Design a protein around this ligand. Structure first.
Ligand SMILES: NC(=O)c1ccc[n+]([C@@H]2O[C@H](COP(=O)([O-])OP(=O)(O)OC[C@H]3O[C@@H](n4cnc5c(N)ncnc54)[C@H](OP(=O)(O)O)[C@@H]3O)[C@@H](O)[C@H]2O)c1
Ligand SMILES: Cc1cc2nc(-c3nccs3)n(-c3cc4nc(N)nc(N)c4cc3Cl)c2cc1C
Length: 157
């Protein structure tokens, strides 16, 4: 299976200045739970944003940099390389990766952040005519998680 994981706001903002525009611990937990024991593929900028590979899954970084060789990270230099990775593969960001892969993935696990943030990077437009709503679950709000959010699982029709 090849899936996208993304958190985007009401206007499909995904990032600002190489970080998330929002603080939402529950999204991080969501992503951790879904990808445990699986594979994440991310662009070079996203990797540098997190700074270190996420433990307990295979971290794959897509970059043109042939000098890239980081401990705990596997490197690829082509989109085509993604299709050679075994198991459940998650496209992990950022904008460039999402743009390159949205037409290729089986499904998408989206955290819709139900707000309007300042962004400099976006998830590409998509239509529910192309995607079946496998599930839609409202996120619980509390002291640590104060922005309304919805977890969508979309499967390509
Ligand atoms: N809300 C979310 O779900 C989420 C998730 C992840 C990231 N983000 C946000 O997304 C933003 C980053 O997105 P971005 O588009 O600027 O960067 P990005 O997609 O993370 O990384 C872009 C880099 O990936 C490499 N790359 C992409 N396609 C390639 C290809 N076909 N062949 C070789 N290398 C390739 C290049 O690295 P080189 O220049 O080294 O060659 C490119 O500069 C940040 O704001 C971040 O916070 C949001
Ligand atoms: C501990 C932790 C730290 C994180 N930092 C980040 C950053 N994202 C952008 C810049 S830095 N994330 C992320 C959260 C994500 N959430 C969803 N829904 N989908 C994605 N593709 C995500 C990707 C990342 Cl890197 C993180 C996810 C976790 C679990």
């Amino acid at each position: 299976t090849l899936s996208i994981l993304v958190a985007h706001d009401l206007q499909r903002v995904i990032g600002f200045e190489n970080q998330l525009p929002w603080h939402l611990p529950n999204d991080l937990k969501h992503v951790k739970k879904l990808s445990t024991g699986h594979t994440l593929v991310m662009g070079r900028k996203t990797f540098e944003s997190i700074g270190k590979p996420l433990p307990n899954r295979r971290n794959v970084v897509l970059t043109s940099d042939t000098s890239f060789n980081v401990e705990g990270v596997d490197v690829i230099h082509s989109i085509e390389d993604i299709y050679q990775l075994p198991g459940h593969v998650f496209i992990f960001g950022g904008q460039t990766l999402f743009e390159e892969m949205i037409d290729k993935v089986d499904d998408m696990y989206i955290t819709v952040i139900e707000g309007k943030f300042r962004g400099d990077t976006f998830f590409p437009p998509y239509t529910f005519e192309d995607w079946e709503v496998a599930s839609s679950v409202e996120g619980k709000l509390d002291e640590k998680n104060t922005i309304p959010h919805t977890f969508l699982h979309l499967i390509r029709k």
